[model samples]
Every structure is written in structure tokens, then in C-alpha cells.
Target: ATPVCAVAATAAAASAACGWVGGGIFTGVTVVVXLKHC
Candidate 1:
């Protein structure tokens, strides 16, 4: 399995650094997390 939490941390960082511009990255990461866990 991949490091999902690691990905999420990166996404959170991106959002903090770039605001809405990083939304797409966060959305994509969320999708991955959902697909993996749900």
C-alpha cells in the first residue's frame, strides 16, 4: 500500500503554501485516500 497519510501531509502543505491554487492537488489526494479506504 502507498503512504496515504504522507500524501495528505503534502497536500496540506501545498494548500498552505498556495491556497486555492493547490486545491486540485488536495482534491486528487483526497480522492486517492477515499478510494483506498472507502
Candidate 2:
């Protein structure tokens, strides 16, 4: 578990950037990666 809002922003950016191409999958994966308590 860590504390980094930048990763949150990364997930947001990934979600928005790849969202149009990959749809919801990118959003879930990115968020999960950061939220997985790493």
C-alpha cells in the first residue's frame, strides 16, 4: 500500500486517453493497478 495521487492522475489520464480506443477495459486495469495496494 502506498500514497500517490499522481498514480491516480495516471489512471485518470490512461482512462481518458485510451478510453476511446480500448473502452472500459483500460479504465478498470489502470485503476486496479494503482488501487491494488502496491
Candidate 3:
């Protein structure tokens, strides 16, 4: 039941991470912090 919202927040947060501490500085991708979690 929570998968949908969970996915969004997950994506947003993950995407946020890639925007930071990452090599490309790709901020417009998605799931901000996903890479961090990955």
C-alpha cells in the first residue's frame, strides 16, 4: 500500500543525493538521494 508514495520519496531523496557528492552534479535526474542509498 505504501509503495507508490514510498517510491516517490525514495526517488526524490535519491535524486537529491546524486546532485551532491556525485561526479556530474546531475541535479535534474530524480530521487535526489537515491545514489547515496545505492
Candidate that would win on lDDT: 1
Displacement of residue 21 (Cα, Å) in model 1 is: 7.2
- Tens-digit lDDT string for candidate 2 (1-38): 15578788878887757675665776677778889864
Candidate 2 Cα RMSD after full superposition onto the native fold (Å): 13.3
Report the number of clashing residue pairs per model: 0, 0, 17
Steric clash pairs (candidate 2): none
Clashing pairs in 1: none
Model 1 error, position 36 (Å): 46
Q: List TM-scores for all candidates, in order.
A: 0.38, 0.36, 0.42
Off by over 4 Å in 1: 20-38
- lDDT of model 2, residue 21: 62
Computed on alpha carbons, the lDDT of every model, listed in order, comes to 0.75, 0.71, 0.65
CA error at residue 20 for candidate 2, angstroms: 2.5
